Nucleic acid binder design. Structure first.
Ligand SMILES: [K+]
Ligand SMILES: [K+]
Ligand SMILES: [K+]
Ligand SMILES: [K+]
Ligand SMILES: [Mg+2]
Ligand SMILES: [Mg+2]
Ligand SMILES: [Mg+2]
Ligand SMILES: [Mg+2]
Ligand SMILES: [Mg+2]
Ligand SMILES: [Mg+2]
Ligand SMILES: [Mg+2]
Ligand SMILES: [Mg+2]
Ligand SMILES: [Mg+2]
Ligand SMILES: [Mg+2]
Ligand SMILES: [Mg+2]
Ligand SMILES: [Mg+2]
Ligand SMILES: [Mg+2]
Ligand SMILES: [Mg+2]
Ligand SMILES: [Mg+2]
Ligand SMILES: [Mg+2]
Ligand SMILES: [Mg+2]
Ligand SMILES: [Mg+2]
Ligand SMILES: [Mg+2]
Ligand SMILES: [Mg+2]
Lengths: 86, 211, 108
RNA sequence: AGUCGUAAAGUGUACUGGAAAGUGCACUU
RNA sequence: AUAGGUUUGGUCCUAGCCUUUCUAUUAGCUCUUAGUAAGAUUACACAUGCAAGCAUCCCCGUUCCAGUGAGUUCACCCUCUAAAUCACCACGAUCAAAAGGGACAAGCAUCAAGCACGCAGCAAUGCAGCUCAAAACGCUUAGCCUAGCCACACCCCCACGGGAAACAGCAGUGAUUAACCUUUAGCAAUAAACGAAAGUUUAACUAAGCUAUACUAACCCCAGGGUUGGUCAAUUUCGUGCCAGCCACCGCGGUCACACGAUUAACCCAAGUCAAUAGAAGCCGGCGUAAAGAGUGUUUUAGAUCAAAUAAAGCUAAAAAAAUAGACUACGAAAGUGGCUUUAACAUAUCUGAACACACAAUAGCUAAGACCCAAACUGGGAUUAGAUACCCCACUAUGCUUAGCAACAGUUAAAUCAACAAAACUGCUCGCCAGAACACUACGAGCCACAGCUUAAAACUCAAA
């Protein structure tokens, strides 16, 4: 398996706690939507295997933070809410 | 019910680990004589044992210095000698030492018990083999040591009932028409007072688990 | 309904009771966002003292401040209870006087 | 709101570009 | 419920909302003493100290007690039968696992199909079966059936392994919530563990600490809280003037306010009072006009007692559709059927029971083709007052045509019949339907469209009405 190569990322001004500022996409595996806090500029480093590429895009689902629950214990995780069907 | 397979896996592997990590007598019943602690577990022995632990010998500490590990020989205990005037001893019939021991001073033994001058019919396993309590009877002393004349062991054969039980029994008899004046009695010849220091069945006893 | 129909349908099933503005709680703590005044519905005329508050549940709500004269400002902490202000439509919450920053009405 | 002014016939539906309503079709008294 | 208030110009009915009663939590203000009972909001994170030893070594115990309510028909009964206690030689009793049989919460059908869920045979294999609208399968909610029981013991259902470094044991702390008890003492009693035993250990427990949360009993002196328009017990004087303000519902406030502020007095309860919240508290009542019952027939697991039609061929008289009879009221399940002849032909020996089965029938609106005498919305043309006739005349479309497609049933008139109005009231029996306005409103969106328009909704929310 290739090693994970790093790539530095800077995010734009945080547009509140309900609207994503970026989706970091790990090729076809999936993506992570980041919501900074207001005015906050964040510094990130994304690691992906050497052969493949990491792509930061404007969010596909920007209001995806809102569908969640409450923090469980001291864990960073939030309880998962199943989305409405289609 | 979603079958719980990890529980079965854990039970099986734990059982396997136990059966392949059975500690030996040399490890279980070793002792540190300066601190009087078991190195295997770190637990201290009770205070009342301390002196004997520093003075007396374990059974195989004696048997490992004898031909055939001392089959046929007589072994007594210090506590028996201090407690009882009548002879108490084991006549050894089988010995299985712990071969891993450096001095071959741990293991199991079987014998015929004579307690307070009364011999048993069969041979059974000896308890407290790992205790620092044992003494070997010299061969030139055995005849003097075993000499015992059975004294008349005539004890009470019946006792009175407790007052209320006696009154209730008499009342029941009188109600059923009986007019007997014979005192109700409780039979105790069948209840034999077995001394608290009589050897127990080493076969039924448990063993310390490895850990 | 016949006996068979009542056996089929079963005992009457009362719908779950509706939660009010306090979500079934005696009181709620809130942070004042802004103070203002509202006009009653008209058999009546006045300038009722009200304030918008963010409740501990995160929801925002309009609350009525009882008594003559209040010193509530933005960012102040208040305790709000139930009870409709009958003349103000949509105002179902009332500020508790004498708790946290909201003090008692001054005498006279 | 006044401190403002003044004394055969129907019901539907469709179309309506000479529509202050008309015509067409079906119904009611 | 022994009920009460509130819709109207007024009466009656229906219906929602609220008041009066009893608890619990929290908040405001106010609180004297004694005894007892009960006692974080959070399965969020935890500094610190304790909560398991005993015992002549072996063993035994730390698998109990104590805690929590996250998850959730493992708890109950019967059968069989381990481990444990006592017989201790077992006969067997007691206690109770695993296994087999039975029973066992609530909502949602806008969750209707599940998809191998069965049987027979020693097996090989064979059959195609099993559950389900009397609710399977599925989603959501919740500890329960309380001398107590079930489940869990930081998380990954489990715990070899991993995350990671654990008070849901006691005391205590941080965060959070409207919610907020001591970092006390002793094993003297009981219980448990161990010991042959004197005994030892125990944050179980016992005895104390704190708290108006409750109960009980006081108190020589010492009372507060709320209310006073009606429901509902109880206002004097001023101040203010639709302002300030007040109310549970109805409602008050515009210069005489018993309704707001103060003051006086009264009323209720009282070491409390009572503001908010949450419970307790409710369908055997109705369906013509208030919410709720017809298109017709057959069948259907169950339940009940009540065991001049229609289709075909032919034929026609007056002027293709059928005057008289017909003042008839027959046939047909309904819609419908009334020119003549002939041929077939008009189910069923109890009743109720279909959205989902089969037949019909009618009503809209579009789609394909076809006929076109006649009539005819629209569309043209001609004539007319002094905004002609909207209205008369002519021509001709869509269309009118033809195909093929998209409360029941049986018995009663005895009773006060009898909210009214309709249509005199009734019983029994069954199915379907009904639990304020609200078959409300609304486009977050979706489809068609393709920048700007069209079609398509429930719920909240509000109110004391409708
Ligand atoms: K022991
Ligand atoms: K629970
Ligand atoms: K668990
Ligand atoms: K004790
Ligand atoms: Mg026209
Ligand atoms: Mg018309
Ligand atoms: Mg009423
Ligand atoms: Mg405790
Ligand atoms: Mg047994
Ligand atoms: Mg069982
Ligand atoms: Mg739960
Ligand atoms: Mg676990
Ligand atoms: Mg604690
Ligand atoms: Mg914890
Ligand atoms: Mg409390
Ligand atoms: Mg306490
Ligand atoms: Mg202590
Ligand atoms: Mg106490
Ligand atoms: Mg007043
Ligand atoms: Mg209080
Ligand atoms: Mg109706
Ligand atoms: Mg029928
Ligand atoms: Mg024509
Ligand atoms: Mg019916």
């Amino acid at each position: 398996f290739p090693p994970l190569v790093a790539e530095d990322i800077m995010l734009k001004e945080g547009l509140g706690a309900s609207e994503a500022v970026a989706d970091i996409k790990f090729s076809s595996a999936g993506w992570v939507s980041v919501t900074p806090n207001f005015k906050d500029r964040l510094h990130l480093r994304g690691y992906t295997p050497e052969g493949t590429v990491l792509t930061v895009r404007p969010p596909l689902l920007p209001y995806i933070v809102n569908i969640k629950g409450q923090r469980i214990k001291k864990s960073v995780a939030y309880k998962t809410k199943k989305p409405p069907s289609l | 019910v979603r079958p719980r397979l990890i529980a079965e896996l854990a039970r099986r592997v734990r059982a396997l680990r136990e059966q392949l990590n059975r500690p030996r007598d040399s490890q279980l019943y070793a002792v540190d004589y300066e601190t009087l602690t078991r190195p295997f577990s770190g637990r201290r022995l009770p205070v009342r044992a301390w002196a004997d632990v520093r003075r007396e010998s374990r059974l195989l500490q004696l048997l490992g210095r004898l031909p055939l590990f001392g089959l046929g020989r007589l072994v007594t205990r210090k506590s028996w000698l201090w407690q009882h005037d009548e002879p108490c001893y084991w006549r050894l019939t089988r010995v299985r030492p712990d071969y891993t021991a450096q001095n071959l001073d741990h293991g199991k033994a079987w014998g015929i018990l004579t307690f307070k001058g009364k011999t048993e019919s069969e041979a059974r396993e000896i308890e407290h083999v790992m205790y620092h309590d044992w003494r070997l009877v010299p061969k030139h002393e055995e005849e003097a040591f075993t000499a015992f004349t059975p004294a008349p062991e005539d004890s009470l054969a019946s006792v009175p009932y407790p007052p209320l039980l006696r009154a209730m029994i008499i009342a029941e008899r009188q109600k059923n028409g009986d007019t007997s004046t014979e005192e109700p009695m409780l039979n105790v010849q069948r209840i034999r007072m077995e001394p608290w220091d009589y050897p127990a069945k080493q076969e039924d006893k448990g063993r310390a688990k490895g850990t | 309904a016949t006996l068979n129909q009542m056996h089929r349908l079963g005992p009457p099933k009362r719908p779950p009771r509706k939660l009010g503005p306090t979500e079934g709680r005696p009181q709620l703590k809130g942070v004042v966002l802004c103070t203002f005044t509202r006009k009653p519905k008209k058999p009546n005329s006045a300038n009722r003292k009200c304030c918008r508050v963010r409740l501990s549940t995160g929801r925002e709500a309009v609350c009525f401040i009882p008594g003559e004269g209040h010193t509530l400002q933005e960012h102040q902490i208040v305790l709000v209870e139930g009870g409709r202000t009958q003349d103000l439509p949509g105002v179902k919450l009332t500020v508790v006087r004498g708790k946290y920053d909201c003090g008692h009405v001054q005498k006279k």
